[PDB]
Every structure is written in C-alpha cells, then in structure tokens.
Amino acid sequence: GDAFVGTWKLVSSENFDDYMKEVGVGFATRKDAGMAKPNMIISVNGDLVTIRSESTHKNTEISFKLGVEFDEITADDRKVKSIITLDGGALVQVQKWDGKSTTIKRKRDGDKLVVECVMKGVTSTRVYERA
Amino acid sequence: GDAFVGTWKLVSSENFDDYMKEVGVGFATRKDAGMAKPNMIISVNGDLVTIRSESTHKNTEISFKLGVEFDEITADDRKVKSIITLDGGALVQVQKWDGKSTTIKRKRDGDKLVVECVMKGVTSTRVYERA
C-alpha cells in the first residue's frame, strides 16, 4: 500500500551484529555492514512492488508481487527463496535457504518505519525515518 | 556463462540521446542519463543471473533466469516485460511494453563488452571494459 511508499534514512540500530553472527555472515563483512547507514527506497507500479537500498559501496534492489514466491540473492551473497506478505498492516518477508529461515518485518510507527529481523531467538531492530 | 561475469566501466557512447528520444524518455531525464558513466556488475549463482548498474544517483539491479520471462521496472520508470537469451555467445534482452519493443544486445569483443540498444531504426553503441 501507499503507507510504505517513499524514501527512508536510517537513524538507529540495535543488536545487529549478533543477528548477523547468527545467520553466518563473515567477520569482515559484518564489521563492514554495520559501519554503514543505508537508505531504503520503496515504490509501487500496479501490482508490482520495489524495494532498493543504497549504500556507499553495496547497492541492491528487489521487484516482487505480494504472496508470490521468488528467487533472491541477498547483499551478503546468500541464494534464498523469498515470500513477502501483508499481515495486518505490516510487510512480512520470509527468507529460506539450506534448512534455515529468517523473518524481516517492516511496520509503521508514527512517522517511523520499524524493521525487525529475527533468526531463531535473536532479534535486531532498525528504525527509519523519511528524507 | 563465465564470459560476462565481472565488473565493467564504460568508456564510450554513441548516438545515445537519439535512442532515448525514440523510446520517449523525458528531456530532463535524457539530459541527466547521458552525463553519467555507469558501471555494470554481472554475476551468476547456479541457474540465477544478476546484472546491476551503479551510478552517482540512479542504481538498479535485475535477477533472472535465461529464457524465462519476468517483470521489470527500468531506470527511466517503464514497466516492461523482459526475456533474456543466449543467442550465439551474445546476451540478447527484449523489453516489451504498450505495443512497443526494444532489444539490448551484450557481446564480447576482445577485452571489451559491446552493448547495442535498438528501437525501430535507431541504434546506440556503448563500449565497456574491465575494472
């Protein structure tokens, strides 16, 4: 919906490194990924949704449809299968690969976009705001 | 194949503006798109191919499989249907939207990657080289 559409700047991050350790990201790459403050750009054209994050080195983007499974190569190079849904006003994305799975939840909170990444027990919280 | 895999820097461009005029890109956007020298990063993971171009403002990326049609939102904001194939050592991509269609051909030439965009009569040539 039009609730997520826009450009966002990151403002906070919590327990991100432990979330990364849990998914198996390499030391040099976690250390790197945590030193940057990405921008999240979300838009929609018809029934097609787009999310792209800019960074001073790593830049990615995904184009998908709700409730339709697709193939994704993450920023950290994992070949996963994604399925994104609209569960009660929140964009719920589930990535699954090699028997494991993680869930990324995007939801509005006033003038902020709250993102919560979870990997069996560990949760990281990143708060965004418009730009 | 492993022939296109790598990072590329642009070195030349020819008749690009006329190619843009033909596809209907807006004046301010063509003027902008031509002042930048993008980088093309191509990689493969299993049967999944990835092409992403970096620029000091506009950054995009596509993930696809050969011979399988998919939905794409171009850098200039056109919602097109793409189909990419391997026609005799050349990556041939066809975009189609609103009764029209364009063809982008990527092929090797020594140590260069030659790209040729065509829109009924008009052809633009952009030459890349490794980085």
Closest Cα to residue B2, out of B49, B37, B35? B49
Closest partner residue to A71 (CB to CB) among B52, B63, B79 is B63
Tell me, in Å, the resolution of the deposited structure.
2.7
**B61 near A CB under 8 A:** yes
Question: How do the domains of chain A map onto residue ranges?
Answer: 1-131
Which stretches within chain B are classed as H helix? 16-23, 27-33
Q: Are B52 and A61 within 8 A, CB to CB? A: yes
Q: Are B79 and A54 within 8 A, CB to CB? A: no
Q: How far is A1 from chain B (nearest CA, A)?
A: 18
Inter-residue contact B89 to B107 (CB < 8 Å) = yes
Helix (H) or strand (E) holding B119: strand B112-119
Inter-residue contact A72 to A83 (CB < 8 Å) = no
Closest partner residue to A59 (CB to CB) among B52, B65, B72 is B52
CA distances from B5 to A124, B8, B11, B52, B89 (A): 34, 9, 18, 12, 13
Residues linked to residue A81 through DSSP beta bridges, in sequence order: A71, A96
**A46 near B CB under 8 A:** yes
Beta-sheet strands, E only, within A2-121: 6-14, 39-45, 48-54, 60-64, 70-73, 79-87, 90-97, 100-109, 112-119
Query: Does B126 belong to an annotated binding site?
Result: yes
Q: Are B59 and A63 within 8 A, CB to CB? A: no
Closest partner residue to A48 (CB to CB) among B60, B61, B79 is B79
Method used experimentally: X-ray
Burial of B122 (0-12, 13-18, 19+ CB in 10 A): middle
Alpha-carbon gap, residue B103 to B114, rounded angstroms? 14
Q: Are A48 and B54 within 8 A, CB to CB? A: no
Query: Does B80 belong to an annotated binding site?
Result: no
CATH class for the region spanning B1-131: mainly beta
Q: A18 — phi, psi (to 5°)? A: -70, -30
Angle at B11 between CA B122 and CA A51, to 5 degrees: 80
CB crowding B22-49: b at 16 or more within 10 Å, else e? bbebeeeebeebeeeebebbbbeeeeeb
Angle at B15 between CA B14 and CA B19, to 5 degrees: 130
